[PDB]
C-alpha cells in the first residue's frame, strides 16, 4: 500500500461543455424494505456528462489503491 | 499506507461550462423501511456535469488509498 | 498512514461556469422508518456541476487515506 | 497518522461563476421515525456548483487522513 | 500493492461536448425487498457521455490496484 | 501487485461530441426480491457515448490490476 | 502481477461523434427473484457508441491483469 | 354566394394525439429573386399531423365558397 | 355573400394532445430580393399539430366565403 | 356581406394539452431587400399546436366573409 | 356588412395547458432594407399553443367580416 | 357596418395554464433600413400560449368588422 | 358604424395561471434607420400567456369595428 | 359611430395568477435614427400575462369603434 515518486533535475488544455438539462447521479444506493446492502468504494469513481482526465501524470507520478471485504 | 514524493532541483488550462438546469447528486443513500445499509467510501468519488481533472501530478507526486470491511 | 514530501532547490488556469437553475447534493442520507444506516467517508468526495481539480500536485506532493469498518 | 513536508532553498488563477437560482446541500442527514443513523466523515467532502481546487500542492506539501468504525 | 515512478533529467488537448438532455448514472444500486447486495469497486469506474482520458501517463508514471472478496 | 516506471533523459488531440438525448448507465445493480448479488469490479470499466482513451502511455508508463473472489 | 516499463533517452488524433438518441449500458446486473449472481470484472470493459482507443502505448508501456474465482 | 339552413322542431368524440418532434407548415410562400407569386386561398385548407373533422354537420347545416382570378 | 340560419322550437368531446418539441408555422411569406408576392386568404386556414374541428354545426348553422383577384 | 341568425323558443368539452418546447408562428411576413409584399387576410386563420374548434354553432348561428384584391 | 341576431323566449368546459418553454408569435412583420410591405388583417387570426374556441355560438349568434385592397 | 342583437323574454368554465418560460409576441413590426411598412389590423388578433374563447355568444349576439386599403 | 342591443324581460368561471418567467409584448414597433412605418389598429388585439375571453355576450349584445387607410 | 343599449324589466368569477419574474410591454414604439413612425390605436389592445375578459356583456350592451388614416 506504498506509493513513491521522485523527480530530480540537474500547451493548451481545453474542455468545452454546453449542456441543456443535464442530470448526473454518482454513487447511489436506492432501496426499499431491504435487509442489507454494502457499497464499498476504494478505487476512483468518476461520473459525469463531461468527464475529462487530461495529463494525469506528467512528471514522476504514482497512484495506488487497495480494497477488501471479509464477512466470515 | 505510506506515500512519499521528493523533488530536487540543482500553458493555458481552460474549463468552460455553460449548463441550463443542471442537477447533480453525489454519494447518496436513499431508503425506506430497510434494515441495514453501509456506504464505505475511501477512494476518490468525483461526480459532476463538468468533472475535469487536469494535470493531477506535474512534479514529483504520490497518492495512496486503503479501504476495508470486516463483519465477523 | 504516513505521508511525506520534501523539495530542495540549490500560466493561466481558467474555470468558467455559467449555470441556470443548478442544484447540487453532496453526501446525503435520506431515509424513513429504517433501522440502521452508516455512511463512512474517508476518501475525497467532490460533487458539483463544475468540479475542476487543476494542478493538484505541482512540486513535491503527497496524499494519503485510510478507512475501516469492523462490526464483530 | 503523521504528515511532514520540508522545503529548503539554498501566473493567473481565475474562477468565474455566474449562477441563477443555485441550491447546494452539503453533508445532509434527513430522516423520519428511524432507529439509528451514523454519518462519519473524515476525508474531504467538497460540494458545490463551482467546486474548484487549483494548485493544491505547489511547494513541499503533504496531506493525511484516517477514519474508523468499530461497533463490537 | 506498491507503485513507484522516478524521472531524472540531466500541443493542444481539446474536448468538445454539446449535449441536449443528458442523463448519467454512475455506480448505482437499485433494489426492493432484497436480502443482500455487495458492490465492491476498487478499479477505475469512469462513466459519462463524454468520457475522455487523454495523456494519462506522459513522464514516468505508475498505477496500481488490488481488490478482494472473502466470505468463508 | 507491483508496478514501476522510470524515465531518464540525459500534436493536436481532438474529441468532438454532439449528442441529443444521451443516457448513460455505468456499473448498475438492479434487482427485486433477490437473495444475494455481488458486483466485484477491479479492472477499468469505461462506459459512455463518447469513450475515448488517447495516448494512455506516452513516456515510461505502467498499469496493474488484481481481483479475487473466495467463498469457501 | 508485476508490470514495469523504463524509457531512457541519451500528429492529429481526431474523434468525431454526432449521435441522436444514444443509450449506453455498461456493466449491468438486472435480476428478479434470483438466488445468487456474481459479476467479477478485472480486465478492461469499454462500452460505448464511439469507443476509441488511439495510441494506447507510444513509448515504453506495460499493462497487466489478473482475476480469480474460488468457491470450494 | 348564398347559404341558408333552417331547423324546426315541433356520444363520445375522442381525438388522441401523442407526437414527438412534430413540425407543421400551413400555407407557405417561400421564394428568392422571383418576379410575381400569387397564393389565392378561399376554400378550406386544413393542415396538420392530427387533422380531424368529426361531425361537421349534425343538424341543418350549409357551407359555401367562391374564388376567382382575373388578370386581363 | 349572404348567410342565414334560423332555429325554431315549439356527450363528451375529448381532445388529448401530448407533444414534445412541436413547431407550427401558419400562413407564412418568406422571401429575399423578390419583386411582388400576394397571399390572399379568405377561406379558413387551420394549421396545427392537433387540428380538431368537432361538431362545427349542431343546430341551424350556415357559413359563407368569397374571394377575388383582379389585376387588369 | 349580410349574416342573420334568429332563434325562437315557445355535456363535457375537454381539451388537454401537455407540450414541451412548443413554438408557434401565426401570420408571418419575413423578407429582406424585397420590393413589394401583400398579406391580405380576411378569412379565419387558426394556427397552433392544439387548435381545437368544438361546437362552433350550437343554436341558430351564421358566419360570413368577403375579401378582395384590385390593382388596375 | 350587416349582422343581426335576435332570440325570443316565450355542462363543463375544460381547457388544460401545461407547457414548458412556449414561444408564440402572432401577426409579425420582420424585414430588412425592403421597399414596401402590407399586412392587411380583417378576419380572425388566432395564434397560440393552446388555441381553443369552444361554443362560439350557443343562442342566436351572427358574425361578419369584410376586407379590401385597392392600389390603382 | 351595422350590428344589432335583441333578446326578449316573456355550468363550470375552466381554463388551467401552467407555463414555465413563456414568451408571447402579439402584433409586431420589426424592421431595419426599410422604406415603408403598413400593418392594418381591424379583425380580431388573439395571440397567446393559452388562447381560449369559451361561450362567445350565449344569448342574442352580433359581431361585425370592416377593413380597407386604398393607395391610388 | 352603428351598434344596438336591447333586452326586454316581461355558474363558476375559473381562470388559473401559474407562470414562471413570463414575457409578453403587445403591439410593438421596433425599427432602426427606417423611412416610414404605420401600425393602424382598430380591431381587438388580445395578447398574453393566459388570454381568456369567457362569456363575451350573455344577454343582448353587439360589437362593431371599422378601419381605413387612404394615402392618395 | 353611434352605440345604444336599452334594458327594460317589467355565480363566482375567479381569476388566479401566480407569476414569478413577469415582464409586460404594451403598446411600444422603439426606434433609433428613423424618419417617421405612426402607431394609431383605436380598437382595444389588451396585453398581459393573465389577460381575462369575463362576462363582457351580461345585460343589454353595445360597443363600437372607428379608426382612420389619411395622408394625401
Amino acid at each position: 500500500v506504498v506509493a513513491a515518486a521522485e523527480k530530480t533535475k540537474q500547451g493548451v488544455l481545453y474542455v468545452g461543455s454546453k449542456t441543456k438539462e443535464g442530470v448526473v447521479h454518482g454513487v447511489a444506493t436506492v432501496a426499499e424494505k431491504t435487509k442489507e446492502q454494502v457499497t464499498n468504494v476504494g478505487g476512483a469513481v468518476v461520473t459525469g456528462v463531461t468527464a475529462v482526465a487530461q495529463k494525469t501524470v506528467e512528471g514522476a507520478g504514482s497512484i495506488a489503491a487497495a480494497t477488501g471485504f471479509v464477512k466470515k
Side-chain angles (χ1 to χ4, degrees), chain A:
Chain A
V1 175
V2 185
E6 43 266 5
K7 182 179 178 179
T8 68
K9 277 184 290 181
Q10 297 176 2
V12 179
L13 276 77
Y14 192 97
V15 175
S17 186
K18 185 183 301 180
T19 73
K20 180 177 180 302
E21 201 180 351
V23 180
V24 175
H25 282 63
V27 176
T29 305
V30 187
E32 181 180 0
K33 205 43 185 62
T34 59
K35 176 180 180 180
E36 46 183 359
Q37 281 168 19
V38 181
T39 308
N40 203 329
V41 176
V45 174
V46 181
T47 292
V49 174
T50 312
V52 182
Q54 274 179 356
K55 293 186 174 180
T56 306
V57 174
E58 178 71 26
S62 172
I63 294 169
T67 67
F69 195 94
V70 179
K71 201 188 180 185
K72 292 179 180 179

